[PDB]
Amino acid sequence: ARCMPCFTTDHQMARKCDDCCGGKGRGKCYGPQCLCR
């Protein structure tokens, strides 16, 4: 399912997950998975 991981130790995890999913607001970190909304 995941675009990439979300690691809580990475304080920029939400910005990285958005980048994976195509831009601002497009990715959600849900536990350890970046999911493209």
From Swiss-Prot:
Keyword Transmembrane: no
One Gene Ontology term, aspect cellular component: extracellular region
Uses described in the biotechnology field: Is under several clinical trials (phase I, II and III) as BLZ-100 (Tozuleristide) by Blaze Bioscience Inc. as a fluorescent imaging agent that labels tumor tissue (CNS, oral cavity squamous cells, breast, skin) to enable more complete and precise surgical resection. BLZ-100 is composed of the chlorotoxin peptide covalently congujated to a derivative of the fluorescent dye indocyanine green.
Keyword tags: Chloride channel impairing toxin, Disulfide bond, Ion channel impairing toxin, Knottin, Metalloenzyme inhibitor, Metalloprotease inhibitor, Neurotoxin, Protease inhibitor, Secreted, Toxin, Voltage-gated chloride channel impairing toxin
Key word Secreted present: yes
One example GO MF annotation: peptidase inhibitor activity
Record localization: Secreted
Domain of life: Eukaryota
Summary of the tissues where the protein is detected: Expressed by the venom gland.
Function: This toxin binds to the surface of glioma cells, and inhibits their proliferation without having effects on normal brain cells. In this context, this toxin has been described as a chloride channel inhibitor (probably ClC-3/CLCN3) by causing its internalization via caveolae. It has also been described to selectively interact with MMP2 (in complex with MT1-MMP (MMP14) and TIMP2), to inhibit its enzymatic activity and to decrease its presence at the cell surface.
Note: Negative results: does not interact with MMP-1, MMP-3 and MMP-9. Was tested in clinical trial under the name TM-601 for treatment of malignant glioma.
Record note on domains: The presence of a 'disulfide through disulfide knot' structurally defines this protein as a knottin.
Protein name: Chlorotoxin
Organism of origin: Leiurus quinquestriatus quinquestriatus (Egyptian scorpion)
